[PDB]
Amino acid sequence: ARLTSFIGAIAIGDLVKSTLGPKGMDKILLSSGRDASLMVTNDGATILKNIGVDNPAAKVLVDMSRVQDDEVGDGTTSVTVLAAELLREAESLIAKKIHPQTIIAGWREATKAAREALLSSAVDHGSDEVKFRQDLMNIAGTTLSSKLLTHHKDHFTKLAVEAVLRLKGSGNLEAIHIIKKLGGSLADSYLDEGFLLDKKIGVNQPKRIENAKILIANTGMDTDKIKIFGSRVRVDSTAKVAEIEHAEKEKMKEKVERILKHGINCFINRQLIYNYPEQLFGAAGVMAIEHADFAGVERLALVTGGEIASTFDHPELVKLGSCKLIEEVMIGEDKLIHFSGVALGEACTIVLRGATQQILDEAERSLHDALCVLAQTVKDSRTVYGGGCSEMLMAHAVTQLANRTPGKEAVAMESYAKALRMLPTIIADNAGYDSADLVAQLRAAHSEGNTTAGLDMREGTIGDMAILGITESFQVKRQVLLSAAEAAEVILRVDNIIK
Amino acid sequence: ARLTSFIGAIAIGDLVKSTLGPKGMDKILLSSGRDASLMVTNDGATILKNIGVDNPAAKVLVDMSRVQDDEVGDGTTSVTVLAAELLREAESLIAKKIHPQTIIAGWREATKAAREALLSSAVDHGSDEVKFRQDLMNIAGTTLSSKLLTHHKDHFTKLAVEAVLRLKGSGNLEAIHIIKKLGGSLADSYLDEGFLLDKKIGVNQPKRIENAKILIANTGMDTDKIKIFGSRVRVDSTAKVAEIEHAEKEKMKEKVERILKHGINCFINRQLIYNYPEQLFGAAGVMAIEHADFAGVERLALVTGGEIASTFDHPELVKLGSCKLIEEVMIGEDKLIHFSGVALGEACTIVLRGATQQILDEAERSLHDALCVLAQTVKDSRTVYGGGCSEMLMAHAVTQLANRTPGKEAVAMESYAKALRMLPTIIADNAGYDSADLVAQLRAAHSEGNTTAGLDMREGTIGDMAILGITESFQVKRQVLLSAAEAAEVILRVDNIIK
Amino acid sequence: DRDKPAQIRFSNISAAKAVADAIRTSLGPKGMDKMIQDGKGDVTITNDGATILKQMQVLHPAARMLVELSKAQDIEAGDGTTSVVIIAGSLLDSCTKLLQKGIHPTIISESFQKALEKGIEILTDMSRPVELSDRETLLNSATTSLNSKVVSQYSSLLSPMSVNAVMKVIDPATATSVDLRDIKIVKKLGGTIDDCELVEGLVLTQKVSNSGITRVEKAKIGLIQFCLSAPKTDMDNQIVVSDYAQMDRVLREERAYILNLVKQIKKTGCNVLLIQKSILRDALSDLALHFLNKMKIMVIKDIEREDIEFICKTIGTKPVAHIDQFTADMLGSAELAEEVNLNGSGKLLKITGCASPGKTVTIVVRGSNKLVIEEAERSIHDALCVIRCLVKKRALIAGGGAPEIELALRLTEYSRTLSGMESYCVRAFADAMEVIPSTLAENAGLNPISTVTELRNRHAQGEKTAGINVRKGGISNILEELVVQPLLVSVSALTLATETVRSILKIDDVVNTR
Ligand SMILES: Nc1ncnc2c1ncn2[C@@H]1O[C@H](COP(=O)(O)OP(=O)(O)O)[C@@H](O)[C@H]1O
């Protein structure tokens, strides 16, 4: 019978079931091989990425979860739990001698009803600046309330809000870029109007450079360009190496003379520069930058309209930029090149301090969620309440719709509504309170006629979600439901032997 | 853990689960010992009576079922299935870590809601003579449609209706009495205005008896009355036996002379008469009746206001009766004493023929149900529809009431409503049709707003129960529900070890 | 589900309890010895807990976490690296019976944090502050906290070194100290240990050469880091050697090749060269040394990386490499050099280093038979460690078991006063604080239960009474015995133990592997 793939897909969802809610459980990931490592994690994405399975359905679910995590924000654990619950319900539904076609039809009807109820229940009262400000603040507070680390959250939230609000409704994702840097204290935040580098050649080179003018010269010294001044090596003696070295030296000195007569003061590039040309440039009086990143020059040329020289092709066609003030201020524990004196405040990089790690990932995720919710709600604000409010309403709508359709697909809708009323139960169980009584009270309040009723995590009571101040996104829940329904329809349609 | 008594009480209900509905399954009861008997039954009462268990809960359930049967008439299988379903639901409810107090409270609330819904849904349109007639006809047709024997049902139904309608609202149960007699054909019905005996002394005695006058004389010939004409036996020889015999003979001849001078023609009694006094009475010219039943003389004295002579106490105080015409007409295959020429048409006995057995039990049960429903609805007609209509309404009322009570007893009401919606499923499964689709259609029709919707057994469709013509009793379902709730509350309160 | 995490937690608790019970009879001055057997059959007698913790090896997450906690405690504070294990074991034993009933770990962690905060505030409000702006009170505190670490004769022997090391008044009573940033205590064999004095600049011990006069002032350090090894051949003999021809070639390669490099290097002023350790050089050509003997010869070998790091930090320069270097950033300070022996064996040169931005001063100690030098080194190490620990704060208290009983009674009264289901968990902490005095009474040789009850009665009656004595063997007041300890050694230890307990309690679920 069919049970192997179902069990394999259900067991993979129960591994990260305790990682839901703000008060989640931690676990270690012991590594094998030569050196046994030990680390503490608190997210399902890192556990699903650093694991290896062999079941087809499990691999498909892992790939779908990875695709969804790469698409939206942190949507990996909820969709997995929902798919596991849907599969566990479908197994018992099939065991009761029920054709899968009726189950698929009932699931489609339930998904359509849930989508209609979610689209019909959308707020739109944001005709002021303070309203959008408080909405963004509540969204950031709800997003940053997943690890339960009360140490430095308000300042980081305000910094992220100020960084994401400077875009002023501009649709771009290559301007604001963050870097990785540790050292200092958690209560240290630096504000600037530009960005920094990531590597310094030293201090032996002269730092006094006037008249800032960016000149991207893609002159390769080992790429075999036109008119090679040197030659190869023959098979006769061992005296041609000196001739090759002299030819390379005179070629590089001619290139240096050309780049000096062309007019430059601060030479920047991204190719591999040897020690001899670097020393020659340092002795001449021009600072050369080597070992550049893969996104620094691109983001520098994108915000100024510039581009690469196309490996020395048209030096009089590529438009170049210029600055005003460029220096090297010793900040923190490293010397970086400053990029000030510009009128474009779209590209900014805020350096961070502290003595902890695993922060840049969550910072980038929060910034992505923020800019997504900003570009989505540019003129039409669409936000919903959290704390287990939309799921209860969707389940109630599905239960109400599953009563006027005579036939045989009502059991599928009932199972869908039962599986949809399980996330608040797990959320309340992960904290340490009575989940059954809270779920019953929430269901009674939703059936009596109260669309604004949620649970509290600070005291474990039932209150209003519109008075305390907590919201989330609108398209995230819809995408989660769509992905869960698609995964359930894909996995349920397979029942034959694995060949 | 507690599971032994629950399994023992659940397995005892699944033995007669296939004996529900008109199209039930038959089984044999092989007996052990010396002679292995074989018989075919089609009722759960005979199976539960001829069986032996050892579990305390099973014994208590069997005793309660037998008591309820002997009280109401029929419904042992129904109450057993209901108790088994309730226990199966309670086991799963307890396995989910739920206190039995909340379950008991929810069951009490569900029972109260069901009783209120049954009391609020009662018809009362019977102000005509033909209305009661058609109601009794429908009740008899629904009661006789449990064995599926289309051979001689209409005539027997009409005979039972005519026999139970002659009471004319008189509350009595000792007037109408049935007897057991086989021989003849199924299409033979005899109508009379009196009753018959059950034993005949022969034909050698004179049958010509005029001036009918019932005289109950309790003159005992071997009970040691006052003034013993004889004596005991001595220890000296073997000649006193003849003296004792002569004394007994002269005493019995003096008693015969006394009963002759008192004035009698048809002597009837119930004691043990020897061969010599019987022969003396036959030679004298008085017919003596011996070997009487335990209920014939009692009913004869009750319908005539008479009583026994109290073993010869006050002969001038006990009132006696008299008749007009008494003969012996050879009817059927046996000669019985007729009881005609009377003005009291309350006591009647209809003799039956045929070549089958196991009919007197169902006949007595039908007569009991008929006289009960007649004495209950003397001036207030209360009837409900059948075919799975009241159970669906009760389940819907319980489900509607289980939605405004916040707490933890809603799961018990949900389990009760789920267990209450299983009798039509078993009824449809015992026939050979799709029970799931029919149950779903019935639930949809009941939720849409149709209180008159039932299932058909002739074609397997869904139609109206008020157009075809089918009803039942009102107090039977209430008593069944009350007994089931009481048994469930009694069994659920036991969970400790059996000591 | 629930059975697997429960079994995992039980196994972790059992492993931690076994690790804590493997060593316990070693707290106090009257501890028992332990003979650790090596893998080859060698045995070593020891009694320190840190040595046993760092010598044994076992693979387990709880054991590794406990080892890391002990290492962090030894690095931060530096004293009492064995009581934290017992505290963690007692807390885990309490959490075992707390979880056996059926309590969520969140409430237990909150109760533990509240109890830790209350104990920290009580320890801070109970301790008395002192002063240290002057030198008299600082010297008094030093001589009061230094006469209770070792025996009397060792203390009297280390007192001169202690008062010589405590005289280093550089930081004007700041928040933190830099005693581990600019200190390089060297060791020298031969002579008398009484000839000790603070020395600035730099101290070396390698002979320069053996020629005429070598008393100059040319930076006294050769800032060179290029390669000085001879060019190795491709094989043994490239051709057949017998008569001349090949002999003249190798003679010119050994005489007229490196000499050109020496000549082109010596053209720059300050002819001072040196080399690192001779761990990779097979043999140095003595002809180059003979040719370098003229026009002043100065070379110093046997130099490690730590010496280079100390020289580049005390003077204030940065080493340079590469051959193509036409700059002038390699000079130093010229003052005085060329020192002789101090009436004995062993060469050692000292430079006072006048007019230098770095005022780093070290202590040059000596000894004999390699028996009193390491002891004095450990003594001055413990001395400057406790000096830094005392200068980090200002609070101090006495030990013996009285603060533990006081904290236990305070936690008991707080759990009795505070309301809520968490109070029971707080009561568990009240049963996880009377382990040190009981262990001390058991190791001393008396009834532990009776002594604990008497101490509790005295604390409930007269608040601060006495503790547990070791020398006399009774119950005497601590004010007569010159023995104290800073408040950080307890506060930091309790905070680290609570953090480790919370970390080991928050980790559960399943332990997947590769
Ligand atoms: N002079 C003393 N009088 C009383 N108790 C002492 C004395 N010296 C040390 N102790 C006790 O010994 C314990 C520490 O013993 P031990 O583990 O050998 O040293 P450490 O903790 O530095 O490794 C302390 O808790 C302290 O109470």
PDB file of C-alpha atoms and ligand atoms in Angstrom, chain C residues 26-29 48 79-83 148-149 399-400 436 440 468-471 483, ligand 1:
ATOM      1  CA  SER C  26      39.692  18.483  46.019  1.00  0.00           C
ATOM      2  CA  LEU C  27      38.065  21.732  47.248  1.00  0.00           C
ATOM      3  CA  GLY C  28      39.925  23.475  50.053  1.00  0.00           C
ATOM      4  CA  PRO C  29      43.480  23.339  51.394  1.00  0.00           C
ATOM      5  CA  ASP C  48      44.477  20.939  40.882  1.00  0.00           C
ATOM      6  CA  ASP C  79      40.425  31.862  40.827  1.00  0.00           C
ATOM      7  CA  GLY C  80      37.934  29.251  41.976  1.00  0.00           C
ATOM      8  CA  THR C  81      37.630  27.206  38.782  1.00  0.00           C
ATOM      9  CA  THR C  82      36.206  24.155  40.596  1.00  0.00           C
ATOM     10  CA  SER C  83      33.137  25.467  42.457  1.00  0.00           C
ATOM     11  CA  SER C 148      46.698  33.812  52.594  1.00  0.00           C
ATOM     12  CA  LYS C 149      47.672  32.080  49.312  1.00  0.00           C
ATOM     13  CA  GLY C 399      34.885  33.043  52.595  1.00  0.00           C
ATOM     14  CA  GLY C 400      34.128  29.884  54.524  1.00  0.00           C
ATOM     15  CA  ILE C 436      30.358  24.274  49.613  1.00  0.00           C
ATOM     16  CA  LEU C 440      34.309  21.825  53.572  1.00  0.00           C
ATOM     17  CA  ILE C 468      34.279  27.217  59.135  1.00  0.00           C
ATOM     18  CA  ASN C 469      37.928  27.135  60.215  1.00  0.00           C
ATOM     19  CA  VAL C 470      40.602  24.810  58.828  1.00  0.00           C
ATOM     20  CA  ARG C 471      43.784  25.511  60.810  1.00  0.00           C
ATOM     21  CA  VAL C 483      41.867  35.947  54.589  1.00  0.00           C
TER      22      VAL C 483
HETATM   23  N1  LIG D   1      42.620  30.031  55.011  1.00  0.00           N
HETATM   24  C1  LIG D   1      41.417  29.494  54.695  1.00  0.00           C
HETATM   25  N2  LIG D   1      40.454  29.337  55.631  1.00  0.00           N
HETATM   26  C2  LIG D   1      39.255  28.804  55.332  1.00  0.00           C
HETATM   27  N3  LIG D   1      38.911  28.388  54.099  1.00  0.00           N
HETATM   28  C3  LIG D   1      39.779  28.486  53.064  1.00  0.00           C
HETATM   29  C4  LIG D   1      41.112  29.057  53.312  1.00  0.00           C
HETATM   30  N4  LIG D   1      41.762  29.038  52.135  1.00  0.00           N
HETATM   31  C5  LIG D   1      40.922  28.502  51.213  1.00  0.00           C
HETATM   32  N5  LIG D   1      39.741  28.172  51.767  1.00  0.00           N
HETATM   33  C6  LIG D   1      38.587  27.564  51.057  1.00  0.00           C
HETATM   34  O1  LIG D   1      39.044  26.734  49.985  1.00  0.00           O
HETATM   35  C7  LIG D   1      38.185  26.881  48.851  1.00  0.00           C
HETATM   36  C8  LIG D   1      38.992  26.832  47.558  1.00  0.00           C
HETATM   37  O2  LIG D   1      39.809  25.664  47.554  1.00  0.00           O
HETATM   38  P1  LIG D   1      40.636  25.210  46.247  1.00  0.00           P
HETATM   39  O3  LIG D   1      39.677  24.667  45.216  1.00  0.00           O
HETATM   40  O4  LIG D   1      41.785  24.348  46.711  1.00  0.00           O
HETATM   41  O5  LIG D   1      41.257  26.586  45.680  1.00  0.00           O
HETATM   42  P2  LIG D   1      40.734  27.245  44.305  1.00  0.00           P
HETATM   43  O6  LIG D   1      39.244  27.401  44.484  1.00  0.00           O
HETATM   44  O7  LIG D   1      41.487  28.552  44.226  1.00  0.00           O
HETATM   45  O8  LIG D   1      41.130  26.239  43.251  1.00  0.00           O
HETATM   46  C9  LIG D   1      37.455  28.205  49.013  1.00  0.00           C
HETATM   47  O9  LIG D   1      36.051  28.021  48.809  1.00  0.00           O
HETATM   48  C10 LIG D   1      37.720  28.649  50.439  1.00  0.00           C
HETATM   49  O10 LIG D   1      36.489  28.763  51.156  1.00  0.00           O
END
